[PDB]
């Protein structure tokens, strides 16, 4: 995770509840309970789409694993691939769908898909992340510790 | 699911050698492969990994720019081309895969799920 | 990235409780892999994702994490357990432990 303007980050919610992982499926949770350690997240720019969108990639595990969105039957679909965020530095079209638009909405962020535009990161209203079409539930907040 | 790899053999310092995996009941498009050596009662290690999808690839620092991973989406075939070879790359060769998707019906975390019995590689004069 | 593997071998009675522990050098990862390989034969796929146990393997065989400590438990050791355990951080440059060579104590 050691390119230009790459920087590590810990990606929470309204309510200081942590992205982390069980078996590739991204959730939300307590980073404090021993249950839910949060994802060390690498965040790096696409530089080929609009920079004034904001356009971000998204790497859990140090950068080794990258968030995408696919679309599929039940809609545009989240979804964590085997792609080092570095591969992804590399560019071209197939680093569009691994690319987030990083929206401010004041102190706060949205994360819209760039493949799946007018789709937002969106966090369970029950104790899996998804996507959905201002909410709090659609609003994060990075810290880099 | 099979993975069948092939082309080891006796090859002298310095020379070339190519092997092959090909794969059956999975497809490349939605998988990694991997090659993995194992040297005489020693212990694993990963070699090179390609991504058919999307044409990315990964080598351990001991072999890049000697061997070169590639793969024919219309085979469902993943080759090694190692080049330069030296006594101390003799091994077992396993090549294996992994599911890319974490949506995928059979992901396991990335884990190697499915290998090859390996092919045996020598590097002698 | 590194994955410390303790102990190098061990042997044990049948039934006995085997655990054996992997470290790994960075805090970021915690897609642990672990494999069985029994003699000629390639690896073997027990657990995945630190603690998922995969399909078909024995429910005796579970693994768990704690920091940056992997650990693989056998609850009662079983005769064909005989093996080397391997655990595997498995992004990008892939790593493999040490290994661990697991005797049956008759």
């Known amino acids: 995770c050691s390119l230009p303007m790459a920087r590590y980050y810990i990606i929470k919610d309204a309510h200081q509840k942590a992205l982390y992982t069980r078996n590739g499926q991204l959730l939300l949770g307590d980073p404090d309970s021993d249950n839910y350690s949060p994802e060390k997240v690498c965040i790096l720019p696409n530089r080929g789409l609009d920079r004034s969108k904001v356009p971000i990639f998204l790497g859990m595990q140090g950068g080794s694993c990258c968030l995408a969105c696919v679309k599929t039957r039940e809609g545009p679909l989240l979804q964590l691939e085997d792609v080092n965020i570095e591969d992804l530095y590399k560019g071209g079209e197939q680093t569009t769908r691994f690319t987030f638009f990083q929206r401010s909405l004041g102190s706060a962020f949205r994360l819209e898909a760039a493949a799946c535009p007018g789709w937002f990161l969106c966090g369970p209203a029950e104790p899996p992340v998804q996507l959905t079409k201002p909410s709090t539930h659609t609003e994060f907040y990075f810290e880099m510790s | 699911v099979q993975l069948v790899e092939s082309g080891g053999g006796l090859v002298q310092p310095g020379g070339s050698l190519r092997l092959s995996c090909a794969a059956s009941?999975?497809?490349?498009?939605?998988?990694?492969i991997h090659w993995v050596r194992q040297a005489p009662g020693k212990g694993l290690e990963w070699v090179a990994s390609?991504?058919?999808?999307?044409?990315?690839?990964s080598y351990a620092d001991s072999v890049k720019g000697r061997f070169t991973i590639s793969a024919d989406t219309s085979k469902n075939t993943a080759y090694l081309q190692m080049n330069s070879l030296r006594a101390e790359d003799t091994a077992v060769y396993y090549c294996?895969?992994?599911?890319?998707?974490?949506?995928?019906?059979?992901?396991?975390?990335?884990?190697?799920?499915?290998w090859g019995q390996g092919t045996l590689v020598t590097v002698s004069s | 990235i590194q994955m410390t593997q303790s102990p190098s071998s061990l042997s044990a009675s049948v039934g006995d409780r085997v655990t054996i522990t992997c470290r790994a050098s960075?805090?970021?990862?915690?897609?642990v892999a672990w494999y069985q390989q029994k003699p000629g034969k390639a690896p073997k796929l027990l657990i995945y994702?630190?603690?998922s146990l995969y399909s078909g393997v024995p429910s005796r065989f579970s693994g768990s994490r704690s920091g940056t400590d992997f650990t693989l438990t056998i609850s009662s050791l079983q005769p064909e357990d005989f093996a080397t355990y391997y655990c595997?951080?498995?992004?990008?440059?892939?790593?493999f432990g040490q290994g661990t060579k697991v005797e049956i104590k008759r």
């Open positions: 294996a895969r992994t599911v890319r998707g974490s949506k995928k019906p059979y992901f396991s975390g990335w884990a190697m799920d499915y």
């Open positions: 009941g999975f497809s490349f498009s939605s998988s990694s």
């Open positions: 390609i991504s058919p999808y999307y044409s990315y690839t």
């Open positions: 960075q805090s970021y990862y915690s897609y």
């Open positions: 994702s630190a603690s």
């Open positions: 595997q951080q498995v992004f990008a440059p892939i790593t």
